[PDB]
Design a protein around this ligand. Structure first.
Ligand code: BCL
Ligand SMILES: CC[C@H]1c2cc3[nH]c4c(c3C)C(=O)[C@H](C(=O)OC)c4c3nc(cc4[nH]c(cc(n2)[C@@H]1C)c(C(C)=O)c4C)[C@@H](C)[C@@H]3CCC(=O)OC/C=C(/C)CCC[C@H](C)CCC[C@H](C)CCCC(C)C
Ligand SMILES: CC[C@H]1c2cc3[nH]c4c(c3C)C(=O)[C@H](C(=O)OC)c4c3nc(cc4[nH]c(cc(n2)[C@@H]1C)c(C(C)=O)c4C)[C@@H](C)[C@@H]3CCC(=O)OC/C=C(\C)CCC[C@H](C)CCC[C@H](C)CCCC(C)C
Ligand SMILES: CC[C@H]1c2cc3[nH]c4c(c3C)C(=O)[C@H](C(=O)OC)c4c3nc(cc4[nH]c(cc(n2)[C@@H]1C)c(C(C)=O)c4C)[C@@H](C)[C@@H]3CCC(=O)OC/C=C(\C)CCC[C@H](C)CCC[C@H](C)CCCC(C)C
Ligand SMILES: CCCCCCCC/C=C\CCCCCCCC(=O)O[C@H](COC(=O)CCCCCCCCCCCCCCCCC)COP(=O)(O)OC[C@@H](O)CO
Ligand code: HEM
Ligand SMILES: COC(C)(C)C(=O)C/C=C(\C)CC/C=C(\C)CC/C=C(\C)CCCC/C(C)=C/CCC(C)CC/C=C(\C)CCC=C(C)C
Ligand SMILES: COC(C)(C)C(=O)C/C=C(\C)CC/C=C(\C)CC/C=C(\C)CCCC/C(C)=C/CCC(C)CC/C=C(\C)CCC=C(C)C
Ligand SMILES: COC(C)(C)C(=O)C/C=C(\C)CC/C=C(\C)CC/C=C(\C)CCCC/C(C)=C/CCC(C)CC/C=C(\C)CCC=C(C)C
Ligand SMILES: COC(C)(C)C(=O)C/C=C(\C)CC/C=C(\C)CC/C=C(\C)CCCC/C(C)=C/CCC(C)CC/C=C(\C)CCC=C(C)C
Ligand SMILES: COC(C)(C)C(=O)C/C=C(\C)CC/C=C(\C)CC/C=C(\C)CCCC/C(C)=C/CC[C@H](C)CC/C=C(/C)CCC=C(C)C
Ligand SMILES: COC(C)(C)C(=O)C/C=C(\C)CC/C=C(\C)CC/C=C(\C)CCCC/C(C)=C\CCC(C)CC/C=C(\C)CCC=C(C)C
Ligand SMILES: [Fe+3]
Lengths: 255, 325, 273, 51, 51, 51, 44, 51, 51, 44, 51, 44, 51, 44
């Protein structure tokens, strides 16, 4: 086989064509991932002077189900929090912020939640997706240890109440939440725990993230039969913030 | 320690799901009958079945079983119909492609005719499974990403078995049907044409394979760390951004200076995986037809290293000194 | 510059060591104690690589080669030009990788997340330390490590496999290749399914998890689910890296002959006639 | 030349000091190793040869 | 050129014979190694004493 | 004998320090055994080409 | 699993006493075994 | 101190006894095997030698 | 010197005793096995080489 | 005065004596063992 | 100097004591093993030789 | 004045006194061991 | 030069002392090992050779 | 006055005095060690 010029043959032409195509593909891939969080801002909420080397993408529209409307991106930030109890620790950019009051109650840091829609997520038939087991026709524990009726122990070693029910996702057949009834000494009413934050044993159920005295301030659902996305985010973030804010020794260097 | 989410603590079972439907009436061709496996349910879903039976799937199954039995029966007859020897040498037997002297003409059944008949039945089977993957998206009213990703691998399949033998002018250029015999083909192909390390498209294919495995370790680990915020429900996170997506993005932004979105990471994954067989097939198609010695090509294009020291064991030691005498 | 939702997460605390002495950001990057150790080690390693390139005589990125010492030096230290620079760069690289993992740990602690990512990165660190520290120590000389060169570390791979005649017949290499191919097929399927659910034909509504579960039971009669697929992908990738480390550490210190001969135990089993 | 102090109105000392502390020690270690990798300026080998 | 390559190392009867009448490691032709096969298909796809 | 202490100052993970000791000073044990007696299955290699 | 949630004082004296009764029995047997072994094949 | 029974109030008998039993059996088996690995104290070879 | 009794005013004695026991066993094992490795202190090989 | 455990001055002082006695008995046993071993086969 | 005691107003006596203990034991073990790794300073073999 | 531990000044002075008393004994024992080792087998 | 105390108005001593101790110990260990890596300055080999 | 740490001028002065006093002792010990090593085996 011959060359076009010098040492240039068909393999070289193919290689350079792939180089050009890959450069265009990298541009497309990086531009496609900029539909959330832009334009950039500084630490005072103003638009930043630098916006980077890539321009922003054009708009796409999503047609949602069950008559929820349309979504156009990139657009305005509708999940933005309004009044955050935070304080700057420096005059410029690049330094951390300090909570003004109680970080766990104010939803800041690892306890932060995003302002999602105030409606439950639906399944294919238009029904709420997560339902307590006491109202779910045909479901039963088929494997593992059933946690209903067991006491719950906090991270500091206190018994705070008993498991009363389980909330399940019927479409995917999975347990999502555990429902806890509190003793009068540790609060009143019922609270929820996400399944990924518990360890179920033979005689107890352990939640290590928070202590007993923190169990009365867990956010509460409005209806006893359904939970919206906003409540889900606030409940999950509350438990997640305890990994750092439960004790002062969890925040300081471990060395 | 905290729960890690690799195994489910407690399982729940309800009525079996039969699937969604629309005006295309997918129920008419679905089998009735389901099962449940509690061993699998420790990791994923426990329900087994049902499955859809169209004509594409039935044709694919029938023609693929035919290919398997022509190969298996040829292997059995090569050994004298001895079942214990058939079991003893299973990994070593194969159905061999034709001899180079026959070109692209039809060879004797003893010397590659059964290989060509069986290759035609495997071809038909594979193209039918792809038409099924396209039809089901069309019937489900979804995108065609799965079919395109499958066609990406079918491209290298066809290059290895159909296109390159035709451009080279011999059916003898095809791959044998065997476990060990097909690995011997790989080594012999690499040796015959210089060194396949110095084929640039082979290097690009390795780049994309390494990148695809690094990305499932990163994506799987990242999604498992945000499951305490509902991060495994990805579609609703796309339609309504939550704190799981924000934390997942900020982890990588603070780690390496840039990040992705919930929807956009799957495009990255789709492209790296798809790019491996495309570059591999382009590299294979250029061998023998254009370039015959890849190491001499590298020497010509000046990316072959040079070494100063000498060759030989007696340039470094002595035979008596290596034995302890 | 910050994203539209990033300011509320930038709080103080969650460090393993250093307190607020290194608790800040440079651009998008977070620095801590392990960000200062990573910078030092990586910069020293790169500068030494380029000094070695200058002394070799070529600056071509394809042709730069820094190599381990001769086998006659054993486990001692060689002169810096005859293989000692390789040893120093190896130490620097180990330090940089460990500092990177411990920095990821602090970022995870600050964000309140799980520690899955550093644990997954530890597997890749283990495959590299097996290639440059564990096999060489067992075999008795640092000269068994691979060289630092873009096209010269492929010559090492080629010569090391033909030193056992037919490397494809290594039993643990066959397991590792299968894991690699399965991870790529599963990543392709997962990406395709999610994109096809989120991007329907023009004029149609988007789909949910029910639709995804249904398509896959119709296609193959089973669906792992939205949570199972990530567990399976992680497990496949980690199994791929662990079996790779095994395939290399048995090739030298455990087996000396060709790998086909290892299969003789199956061919001469007493049950066979 | 007399207005150089205004550099501290731009950069916070906390970041600059740690950057300089990393940079200086990195430079010193490198020059000692570039010196240790020559024949003429390796002071460990000179003591062995001059002995 | 082969037997005196590096030093004086000749051959006697005690090099192929080692106390035996038939020397060890001798070989014969065994080529059609499978049945029902004709060209390159008749020589390879089997674990034998010569492979 | 005034032990209303054990029960009042109760939470103590009495085992973790021991596990850490048995893990840390257990690596000193295998190191000591590889230094006293040597490598079980050692092997040596002959170099045939460049480093 | 802790349901006993701590032993008491008088639920431990009896335990110590029974435990000590087995330890002394096992040790007497070991002493006789070692004496017989030394008589058979000495090592000092 | 005169009565050391006050050590079981900081322990759980169940796991202590299990660990004790496992440790005792493992140590006895290892001593027996170490004796069996010695020329002078292998009582199975001695019967064959006294034959 | 005479005021060392405050170490338990700082340390958890119950958490320290278990670690002490584990540490002490590992040390003793290591020493016997190291002593078993030497030609002059292997007390089993002595009796064989002493009649 | 100050504590991180809960004990007091005199009470920890009394708790130290049991540890001291046990340590001295252990040390005496080990010393006799080493003294016998040195006469059996010296290492210096 | 007379004012060194103020080190205990910046540091906490509990992690200092834990850290020191681990560091000292590891350093002692490392030095003892390094001595064991040599030819001149191995005290087990010198007794055998002088015997 | 300055304090980060909550410990006072007199407590620090007592703690440092006991700590230095405990350190000098360790130093003296190590010095005696090093001298004996040098007499047995010199390294300089 | 007389105002260098103001360094404690920028950096917290608690987090500086730990880093300085780690740095100092690592540097000392590296220098001792570098000396041990030579022929003229290895004091374990010198005692064996001299005696 | 400027303070990012929380200390006053007097506290910083008192801290620096003791820190420099410790540094000089460390340096003096190192100087004596280096002089002894140079006498034993000189470099340069
Ligand atoms: C001596 C050995 C040679 C060598 C010779 C070759 C040869 C020859 C080839 C590879 C190829 C590849 N090499 Mg190489 N390779 C070497 C060393 C390496 C090393 C290394 C040392 O670490 C690595 C990482 C690799 C890796 C790779 C991959 C990157 C690449 C395969 C692409 C792919 O998509 O695979 C995945 C495989 C496929 C997509 C195959 C398609 C499968 C089809 C679609 C299956 C259909 C369905 C089926 C019939 C039904 C089954 C039954 C069902 C159960 C119903 N090589 C050395 C230099 N290499 C290939 C390539 O592309 O070269 C550029 C190739 O042909
Ligand atoms: C790369 C992915 C591979 C794959 C995976 C896969 N397929 C599967 C499964 C899995 C993991 C099943 O569990 C499921 C099955 O039940 O198989 C027996 C199945 C299946 N894939 C099938 C088809 C199929 N898959 C294909 C492809 C693939 N699927 C790939 C090889 C193809 C081709 C040619 O491409 C085909 C044609 C069927 C064999 C089967 C469809 C399921 C079905 O019809 O179930 C009916 C229900 C039953 C009553 C049968 C269950 C058996 C027991 C009596 C139930 C009790 C469970 C018991 C406790 C455990 C036993 C189950 C075991 C599978 C663990
Ligand atoms: C992008 C490149 C990657 C990739 C992707 C990829 N592969 C794919 C797809 C995609 C996107 C599919 O959609 C398709 C699929 O169906 O996936 C589930 C597939 C697929 N890739 C496959 C294989 C495969 N892919 C490979 C590679 C790769 N595919 C790359 C890593 C490899 C290798 C060598 O690494 C292999 C071996 C199949 C599982 C499947 C294609 C199915 C097909 O065409 O089947 C034809 C069927 C027959 C042969 C007839 C059946 C006869 C059988 C011999 C027996 C009966 C069937 C039974 C279920 C099996 C036996 C089990 C018993 C217990 C019953
Ligand atoms: C299951 C194991 C898989 C895996 C996992 C893995 N790797 C990871 C992660 C995970 C989960 C991360 O989180 C982490 C990350 O941040 O990714 C973006 C990472 C990462 N793995 C990477 C790459 C990588 N991973 C690879 C593979 C894999 N990693 C496996 C397939 C490969 C190859 C060869 O296949 C490469 C090249 C990095 C991009 C990244 C983070 C490493 C990093 O940045 O470390 C800090 C160091 C520097 C910035 C520079 C160090 C400079 C040195 C001092 C000098 C260089 C010397 C070097 C040895 C020369 C080599 C020359 C070659 C030509 C031979
Ligand atoms: C030659 C140059 C590199 C130096 C040489 C040595 C290293 C070589 C190896 C890898 C290079 C990776 C370097 C990436 C570092 C990125 C640093 C960063 O962070 O850069 C961002 C800008 O980057 C990005 O946005 C991502 C860039 C792509 C990432 C790498 C892709 C690897 C793809 C494939 C694998 C590659 C193998 C080759 C295939 C050969 C193929 C023929 C600034 O921030 P940003 O906010 O994101 O700005 C953007 C926007 O937002 C505007 O607003
Ligand atoms: C294709 C043919 C053969 C191969 C591959 C082969 C290979 C070799 C090689 C490479 C050496 C040199 C070894 C070294 O330098 O260390 C050698 C030497 C030798 N071979 Fe063979 N050999 C072959 C056949 C034979 C046969 C059949 C005989 C004897 C009748 C034989 C007798 C010898 C002798 C005597 C030596 C030693 C000579 C020396 O190194 O001084 N070889 N062979
Ligand atoms: C963890 O935090 C806290 C606060 C608890 C601590 O830090 C606590 C720490 C401890 C409680 C530490 C305790 C340490 C020990 C108990 C150490 C004990 C050490 C020894 C008993 C060492 C003995 C060493 C003996 C040696 C080396 C003997 C050598 C002998 C020879 C070489 C023989 C040659 C001798 C000749 C020729 C005689 C000439 C010698 C003369 C000195 C005259
Ligand atoms: C040759 O090259 C290589 C690299 C191999 C080397 O070997 C290099 C080695 C080095 C570079 C080594 C370096 C070693 C050091 C820097 C060592 C330093 C050691 C010390 C500073 C040791 C200090 C020890 C102190 C001790 C043991 C103190 C003990 C005290 C007590 C037991 C008293 C306890 C106090 C109490 C209870 C206070 C009372 C409490 C109240 C509340 C009042
Ligand atoms: C051979 O060629 C190769 C490539 C090998 C090279 O080696 C090339 C090398 C180079 C190109 C090298 C280049 C080097 C430089 C550019 C070096 C620059 C160096 C400096 C600018 C150094 C500056 C050092 C400054 C110092 C030490 C300043 C201050 C120290 C203090 C302790 C000050 C204390 C300050 C206080 C207390 C402030 C408190 C005040 C208040 C008001 C609170
Ligand atoms: C040869 O080439 C190679 C690369 C191999 C090298 O070896 C290169 C080597 C180098 C480039 C080395 C460089 C080394 C340095 C720059 C070293 C620097 C070292 C120091 C600055 C050390 C400082 C030490 C200071 C000390 C020890 C100070 C104080 C100690 C105290 C114990 C004081 C305690 C303080 C108290 C109590 C204050 C409390 C007071 C109150 C009021 C609360
Ligand atoms: C040759 O080189 C190598 C490395 C191989 C070596 O051999 C090196 C070896 C070393 C460096 C070894 C070093 C060893 C040591 C430093 C060992 C030190 C050991 C001790 C200080 C041990 C002390 C033990 C004391 C004991 C057991 C005393 C009493 C205990 C009790 C009475 C238990 C009950 C206690 C109380 C108070 C009641 C219970 C109360 C509660 C609140 C639970
Ligand atoms: C006898 O026992 C029973 C009945 C149980 C059996 O049936 C047993 C069966 C077996 C034991 C079977 C074993 C089978 C194997 C071990 C099979 C192995 C197969 C492979 C590794 C196959 C690889 C195939 C192909 C490769 C690597 C690449 C490309 C191929 C193709 C594109 C093929 C397509 C061919 C075409 C298009 C040519 C057709 C010709 C025309 C003229 C149209
Ligand atoms: Fe995903």
């Amino acid at each position: 086989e011959e060359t076009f010029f010098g040492n240039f043959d068909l393999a070289s032409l193919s290689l350079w064509l792939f180089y050009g195509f890959f450069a265009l593909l990298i541009y497309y891939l990086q531009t496609e991932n900029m539909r959330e969080g832009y334009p950039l801002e500084d630490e005072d909420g103003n638009t930043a002077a630098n916006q980077g080397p890539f321009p922003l993408p054009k708009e796409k529209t999503f047609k949602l189900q069950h008559g929820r409307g349309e979504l156009t991106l990139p657009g305005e930030d509708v999940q933005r929090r309004d009044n955050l109890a935070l304080r700057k620790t420096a005059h410029g950019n690049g330094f951390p912020m300090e909570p003004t009051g109680d970080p766990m109650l104010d939803g800041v840091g690892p306890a932060s939640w995003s302002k999602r829609r105030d409606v439950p997520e639906l399944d294919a038939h238009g029904h709420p997706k997560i339902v307590p087991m006491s109202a779910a026709e045909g479901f039963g524990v088929s494997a593992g240890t059933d946690p209903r009726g067991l006491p719950v122990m906090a991270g500091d070693g206190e018994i705070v109440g008993l498991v009363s029910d389980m909330w399940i996702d019927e479409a995917e057949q999975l347990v999502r939440y555990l429902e806890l009834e509190l003793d009068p000494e540790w609060g009143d009413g019922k609270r929820l725990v996400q399944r990924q934050m518990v360890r179920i044993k033979s005689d107890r159920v352990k939640v290590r993230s928070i202590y007993g005295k923190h169990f009365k301030n867990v956010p509460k659902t409005k209806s006893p039969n359904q939970v919206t996305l906003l409540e889900e985010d606030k409940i999950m973030a509350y438990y997640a913030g305890g990994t750092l804010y439960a004790d002062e020794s969890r925040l300081e260097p471990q060395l | 320690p905290e729960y890690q989410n690799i195994f489910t603590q407690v399982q729940v079972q309800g009525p079996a799901e039969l699937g969604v439907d629309n005006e295309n009436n997918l129920t008419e061709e679905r089998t009735t009958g389901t099962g449940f496996s509690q061993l699998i349910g420790w990791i994923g879903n426990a329900q087994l079945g049902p499955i859809y039976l169209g004509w594409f799937g039935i044709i694919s199954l029938v023609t693929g079983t035919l290919w398997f039995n022509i190969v298996g029966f040829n292997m059995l007859s090569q050994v004298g119909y001895s079942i214990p020897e058939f079991i003893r040498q299973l990994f070593w037997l194969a159905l061999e492609p034709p001899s180079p002297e026959y070109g692209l003409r039809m060879p004797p059944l003893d010397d590659g005719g059964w290989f060509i008949i069986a290759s035609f039945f495997l071809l038909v089977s594979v193209i039918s499974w792809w038409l099924r993957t396209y039809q089901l998206a069309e019937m489900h009213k979804m995108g065609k990403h799965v079919a395109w990703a499958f066609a990406a691998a079918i491209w290298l399949f066809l290059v290895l078995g159909l296109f390159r033998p035709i451009l080279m002018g011999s059916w003898s250029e095809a791959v044998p049907y065997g476990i060990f015999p097909h690995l011997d083909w790989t080594t012999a192909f690499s040796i015959r044409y210089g060194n396949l390390y110095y084929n640039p498209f082979h290097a690009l294919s390795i780049v994309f394979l390494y990148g695809s495995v690094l990305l499932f370790a990163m994506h799987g680990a990242t999604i498992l760390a945000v499951t305490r915020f509902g991060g495994d429900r990805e579609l609703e996170q796309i339609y309504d951004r939550g704190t799981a997506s924000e934390r997942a993005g900020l982890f990588w932004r603070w780690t390496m200076g840039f990040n992705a979105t919930m929807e956009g990471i799957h495009r990255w994954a789709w492209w790296f995986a798809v790019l491996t067989p495309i570059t591999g097939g382009i590299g294979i198609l250029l061998t023998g037809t254009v370039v015959d010695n890849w190491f001499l090509w590298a020497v010509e294009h000046n990316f072959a290293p040079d070494y100063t020291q000498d060759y030989g064991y007696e340039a470094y030691t002595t035979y008596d000194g290596f034995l302890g005498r | 510059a910050l994203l539209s939702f990033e300011r509320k997460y930038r709080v103080r605390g969650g460090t393993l060591i250093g307190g607020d002495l290194f608790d800040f950001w440079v651009g998008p990057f977070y620095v801590g104690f392990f960000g200062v150790t990573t910078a030092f080690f990586a910069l020293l390693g790169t500068i030494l690589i380029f000094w070695g390139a200058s002394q070799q005589g070529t600056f071509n990125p394809w042709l730069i080669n820094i190599a381990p010492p001769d086998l006659s030096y054993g486990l001692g230290m060689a002169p810096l030009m005859e293989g000692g620079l390789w040893q120093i760069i190896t130490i620097c690289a180990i330090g940089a990788f460990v500092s990177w993992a411990l920095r990821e740990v602090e970022i995870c602690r600050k964000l309140g997340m799980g520690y899955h990512v550093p644990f997954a990165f530890s597997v890749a660190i283990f495959a590299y330390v097996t290639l440059v520290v564990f096999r060489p120590l067992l075999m008795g000389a640092w000269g068994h490590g691979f060289p630092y060169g873009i096209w010269s570390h492929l010559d090492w791979v080629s010569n090391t496999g033909y030193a056992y005649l037919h490397f494809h017949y290594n039993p643990a290499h066959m397991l590792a290749v299968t894991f690699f191919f399965t991870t790529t097929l599963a990543l392709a399927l997962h990406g395709a399914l999610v994109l096809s659910a989120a991007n329907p034909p023009k004029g149609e509504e988007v789909k949910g998890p029910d639709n995804e579960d249904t398509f896959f039971r119709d296609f193959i009669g089973y669906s792992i689910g939205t949570l199972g697929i990530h567990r399976v992908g992680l497990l496949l990738a980690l199994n791929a890296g662990f079996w790779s480390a095994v395939c290399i550490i048995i090739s030298g210190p455990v087996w000396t002959k060709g790998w086909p001969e290892w299969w003789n135990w199956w061919l001469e089993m007493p049950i066979w006639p | 030349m007399s207005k150089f102090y205004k550099i501290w109105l731009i950069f916070d000392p906390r970041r600059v000091f740690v950057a300089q502390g990393v940079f200086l020690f990195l430079l010193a270690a490198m020059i000692h190793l570039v010196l240790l990798s020559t024949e003429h300026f390796n002071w460990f080998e000179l003591a062995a040869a001059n002995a | 050129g082969h037997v005196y390559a590096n030093a004086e190392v000749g051959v006697t009867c005690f090099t192929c014979h080692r106390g035996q009448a038939v020397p060890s490691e001798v070989w014969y032709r065994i080529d059609p190694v499978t049945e029902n096969t004709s060209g390159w298909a008749s020589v390879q796809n089997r674990a034998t004493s010569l492979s | 004998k005034w032990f209303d202490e054990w029960n009042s100052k109760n939470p103590t993970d009495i085992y973790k320090p021991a596990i850490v000791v048995g893990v840390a000073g257990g690596a000193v044990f295998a190191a000591a055994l590889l230094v006293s007696m040597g490598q079980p299955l050692a092997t040596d290699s002959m170099q045939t080409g460049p480093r | 699993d802790l349901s006993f949630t701590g032993l008491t004082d008088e639920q431990a004296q009896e335990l110590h006493s029974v435990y000590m009764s087995g330890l002394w029995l096992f040790s007497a047997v070991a002493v006789v075994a070692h004496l017989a072994t030394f008589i058979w094949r000495p090592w000092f």
